[PDB]
């Protein structure tokens, strides 16, 4: 049981060759998967008669500046100016100036620097922030150094296989829509709890975080057309707290009639508008959150508009077409400057999500090519994140991990969002599963001010660095003005009061149907808050 060929474990049994620290205990006491001898025991000291080169290649000084590369990257030949009449004391080199045995001075760039490219004996600092997945949330550059700082609302938490930053609040829920119901799931508590039930033909989900700050977010959901009856966009409250089943959720239709297959829906929380894409109507259009002032936004060159997304910070909307000519296109929320981001090596782009906290990077899911890719919002630097994704149907990004639904398996799957590590399975649900969406506040930055000055009569759409005026379909501006439109205004729609029993108790309808809670043991108040 010799160390050079066998790993002598604590239990006196020895382990053959490469099995040491392979990821499975071949010893039988747990120390086979430990740091000890297998993990980085020595760090190669090299002498004045060698150069430990740019990449750690230690080579004899006789080979340095001999005009034959040993180092691989030619760093043992970098500079190589020659003549014994020359010394390092003359200081030609910017930083680590050194003296060689033959022909005078020879000089290395410092660790974290490369030779100047416009000249030798000179070096730049590497801007390491440009490397993909070098920092989890943010990067600041320094001379051969950097910091993985993370933005406000993210506490730095040292973790396994690297450091990440926490959620600074309640653990994220997943929303999981099936044809007949929407389900919740606490990612930390790992329990389902009842939500919208006795529904039919559901297809997609988005939400507005606590618009009235009364501690109740609202989720928007789509119902498909069935038989000879049209679909609907409907909306309902969802508790941010732990309550469920005890709270009768009341659905209300927005009244957006003449609707067939809204496979894509997104809610602009800044502009207070709802964007949806009807596959059968071959258009993507916009209306206010309560369903007034319907306006067709884009109606040309759309075969089958799939899932869409909006980025109010940059004033850019994104959507996917999965017809005969697959493509991913972005435009202003106004609808101007429509452009195509990616149209090559695309199968069925059916789910799209934006990483707001990381350079506003865009990810999408391809259910035909069986891959998930990421591109910058301008369309450069395309790279596949994960392959063999087993036909992802939908995706969402949260923290340092990416979520998707493996469609026909009905499984929810999870992975490092930078393409590293190995896949993880979260849970298994019906083949009726049609989305995953992380229900959390950090997921949509709530402190993004709406630039609208209330000047607009009916709609105030966003655009990069500002806003614009528009009015419903089949109407035009009053002649000479670009604000007022001739269409008669409509009053905002009143949403019925919700059920709010936080720590427990059951909702109840009185004579005028106002909600009221029967508080549980050891809690009191109108909504059973303190006890």
């Amino acid at each position: 049981c010799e160390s050079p060929q066998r790993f002598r474990c604590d239990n006196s049994r020895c382990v053959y060759g490469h099995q040491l620290c392979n990821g499975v205990d071949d010893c039988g006491d747990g120390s086979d998967e430990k740091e000890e001898h297998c993990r980085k025991p020595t760090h190669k000291p090299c002498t004045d008669t060698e150069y430990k080169c740019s990449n750690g290649n230690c080579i004899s000084q006789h080979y340095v500046c001999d005009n034959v590369n040993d180092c691989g990257d030619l760093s043992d030949e970098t500079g190589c100016n020659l003549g014994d009449n020359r010394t390092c004391a003359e200081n030609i080199c910017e930083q680590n100036c050194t003296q060689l045995s033959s022909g005078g001075f020879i000089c290395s760039c410092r660790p974290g620097f490369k030779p100047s490219t416009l000249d030798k004996n000179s070096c730049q600092d590497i801007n390491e922030c440009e490397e993909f997945g070098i920092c989890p949330q943010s990067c600041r550059n320094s001379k051969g150094s950097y910091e993985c700082f993370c933005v406000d609302g993210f506490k730095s938490m040292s973790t396994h296989y690297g450091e990440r930053c926490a959620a600074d609040g309640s653990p994220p829920l997943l929303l999981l829509p099936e044809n007949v119901r929407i389900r919740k799931y606490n990612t930390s508590s790992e329990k389902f709890s009842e939500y919208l039930e006795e529904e039919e033909h559901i297809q997609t989900i988005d939400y507005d975080w606590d618009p009235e700050h009364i501690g109740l977010s609202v989720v928007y959901y789509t119902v498909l057309a069935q038989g000879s009856q049209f679909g609907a966009i409907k909306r309902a409250y969802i508790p941010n707290f732990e309550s469920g089943s005890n709270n009768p959720i009341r659905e209300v239709d927005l009244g957006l009639k003449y609707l067939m297959q809204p496979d894509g829906l997104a809610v602009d929380w800044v502009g207070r508008h709802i964007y949806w894409s009807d596959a059968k109507s071959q258009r993507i259009e916009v209306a206010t959150l309560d369903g007034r002032y319907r306006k067709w936004l884009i109606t040309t060159q759309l075969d089958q508009p799939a899932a869409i997304a909006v980025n109010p910070k940059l004033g850019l909307m994104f959507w996917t077409d999965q017809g005969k000519q697959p493509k991913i296109e972005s435009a202003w929320m106004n609808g101007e400057h429509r452009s195509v981001l990616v149209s090559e090596n695309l199968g069925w782009p059916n789910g799209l999500s934006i990483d707001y906290l990381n350079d506003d990077r865009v990810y999408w899911s391809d259910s035909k090519e069986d891959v998930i890719e990421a591109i910058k919002y301008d369309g450069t630097d395309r790279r596949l994140i994960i392959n063999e994704a087993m036909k992802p149907f939908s995706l969402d990004i949260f923290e340092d991990k990416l979520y998707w639904v493996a469609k026909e398996k009905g499984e929810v799957w999870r992975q490092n969002k930078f393409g590293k590590e190995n896949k993880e399975k979260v849970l298994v649900v019906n083949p009726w599963l049609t989305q995953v969406r992380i229900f959390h506040q950090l997921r949509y930055n709530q402190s993004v001010s709406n630039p609208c000055k209330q000047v607009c009569s009916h709609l105030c759409l966003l655009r990069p660095g500002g806003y614009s005026c528009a009015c419903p379909q089949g109407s035009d501006f009053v002649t000479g003005s670009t604000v007022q439109c001739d269409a008669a205004s409509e009053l905002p729609v009143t949403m019925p009061p919700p059920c709010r029993c936080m720590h427990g108790g059951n909702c109840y309808f009185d004579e005028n149907e106002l909600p009221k809670c029967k508080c549980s043991s050891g809690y009191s108040g109108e909504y059973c808050e303190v006890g």
Binding site: A225, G227, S228, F230, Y258, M260, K280, S281, Q473, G474
Partner: protein
């Protein structure tokens, strides 16, 4: 329509183009233009009746406030 008796004609059928006075239904079928918003389900799933608050009728037809043409 199954004419041969063994559905030979309808097998691998690519839907035909519509002509100048026809509207292509949701499920890729052509019907007369005069059937669009006429208070009847003609495309099988009322897809012709879809969203006609925003179009005029034929010159000889009166338009109801609900967008239908009579």
């Amino acid at each position: 329509t199954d004419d041969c008796g063994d559905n030979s004609d309808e097998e691998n059928c690519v839907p035909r183009e519509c002509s100048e006075s026809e509207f292509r239904c949701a499920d890729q079928q052509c019907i007369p233009s005069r059937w669009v918003c006429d208070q009847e389900n003609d495309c099988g799933d009322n897809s012709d009746e879809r969203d006609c608050e925003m179009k005029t009728c034929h010159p000889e037809h009166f338009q109801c406030t609900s967008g239908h043409c009579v």
